[PDB]
Amino acid sequence: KKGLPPGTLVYTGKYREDFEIEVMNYSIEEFREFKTTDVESVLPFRDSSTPTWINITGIHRTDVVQRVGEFFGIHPLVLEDILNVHQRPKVEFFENYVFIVLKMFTYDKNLHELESEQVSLILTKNCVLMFQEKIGDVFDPVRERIRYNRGIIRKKRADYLLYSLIDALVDDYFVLLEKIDDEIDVLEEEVLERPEKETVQRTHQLKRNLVELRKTIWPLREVLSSLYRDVPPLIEKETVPYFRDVYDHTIQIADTVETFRDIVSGLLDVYLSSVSNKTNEVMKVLTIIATIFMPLTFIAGIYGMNFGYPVVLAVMGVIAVIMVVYFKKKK
Template sequence: MTGRRWDMGATRRVGRVFARRAGSGPAPLDLVGSGKLDGALVDWAFYRDGRRDTKIGSYVDALTRARRDDGFVWIGLFQPNEQQLAVIGSEFGLHPLALEDATEAHQRPKLERYDDTLFAVLKTVRYVPHGTLTATSEVVETGEVMIFCGPGFVITVRHGDHGELKGLRQHLEKEPKRLAAGPGGVLHAITDHVVDSYLEVADAVQADIDVIETEMFSPRGWRNIERVYQLKREVLELKRAVAPLTGPMRALSTGRHPLIADETRNYFRDVDDHLLRVKEQVISFDELLSSILQAGLAQVQVAENEDMRRISAWVAILAVPTMIAGIYGMNFDYIPGLNSPSGYFVCLAVMGAACALLYGLFKRNRWL
């Protein structure tokens, strides 16, 4: 849940690597064969007319075809390091600031345009299953997907152990019409996939809130107040992933860009609608949990007041025999009944009657 760290040193390092490679002529194209992307490359392919060209066996041919003919290259990376992104940046002409953001995790969801390239940052979320919600349970786990979308290429950079896009790529390859829309179509498919995961997580969190709400308003439910606080923190994590994305999604659904066809922009409107729905749902979660938390605090105060009334009632009851015993414990010669054979028993009877009377009064007023 840490915010963005503005590391100017990292910016300069990426910029120097980028400038050095860009200024020394074309960089080697065979990134896969040279091992420069080892450990970071998940998958890559060249798509033309919506279909994967399996005849292209090298990355050199794929990139050349993408630059020369219709079609595009889709490269998937997982947590690449600075040098690997610098190589990618030199090949595709990516801006150093965008490369810095792709290197650093914990970015805010956003959409930026660098000349003819779009750079999008999306927060991925995953619901963490748990048996019983505790004061330390992790309910929502977040990651990130960065997308470079330009003429003839899509580069996805993923941070986090979840939110993988391999299944999405396979699904799209079964629908050539969507891939035929080019890089803009892939951008839409990824945003749609991420927003759909928001809806699934929101439904799961709703079930947790229903359980904690029921328990909170049960007898002695204020004991669950720490669990409410923990769930509220997890909802805020979900809110930080969803809420900032509304601006970028609205820009994709209403703005014009050469990479996004008019028909694809219509689909972005549908994604924007789903995002607004889940945003409203998450905001309502936050407000509901705030109300439950306040109700829990009120229950704590009521319980404390009830305890104080019980203590005060018993103190008042015990004060009567204490007072009488204290008076008769004085060393005076002339105290009524002191020398009477029945004085002791009369004193005990008076104490018992006074205590019984006070107990009845407090019981009737529900202090006991």
């Protein structure tokens, strides 16, 4: 739905069940993790000269974001955007912090429909502050790769941490495409070799979903494009050439999606031709068994007049052959 105030703090999303603030402060050497539901127990991490990750799951608490935002020096309107989930993904560069809004998807296979949660990211000094609206994410491997010190996460700084969550979120889209490639694959057979009923409505659902998809990658692609040209906190030849290979991913997604929305585009045209081909066969059979049985039931019509038996049957049986011969141009 919509708002009508001047720039307040309303939450438009519809996930009012969960609230769980997780934090992962780490150095080149160490880390902890906890799940406090207290607001204040995370504010002292602003000055921690070591990479923190203050994940605030459950945005519906406008009051929680209001406090954290007033403390971290976050602008009043850039908080509103965190709460307003009906927004195109963007990157906002500021004097202190980099602000990113992203959306991650869930495709219900079978029940052809996709659902969208909006994740906000604020990068400031050594804090990648996060905002989810519901419990559960695709950021499970990244926190696990900090947990069992796997790879080059602990070794590197705090801005690199952002370019690890963003890899994890973009990587998820590769799953969605995989589900849809395998979707099309089937709902395409359903047009060649299954000309039934709700195959059409299943096809229109796909275009609908693909448009819905497209108009959330094409912007998310621009985020990593705009996150590439500029960047204040970057550590040039460390974190920049890294996400070149996430902005590379962000392209392949919105390139794959443009393939799907180009195959599915001309799929209903396959149907209409496949169907008009069937309504040729049926049409044809009707015209045959009415050019052998409509001429003959006319002969056997006159000879019911009230005013050689094998002379009429011979001349009927010969016409039913001057017919099935003439119908060798048509078969």
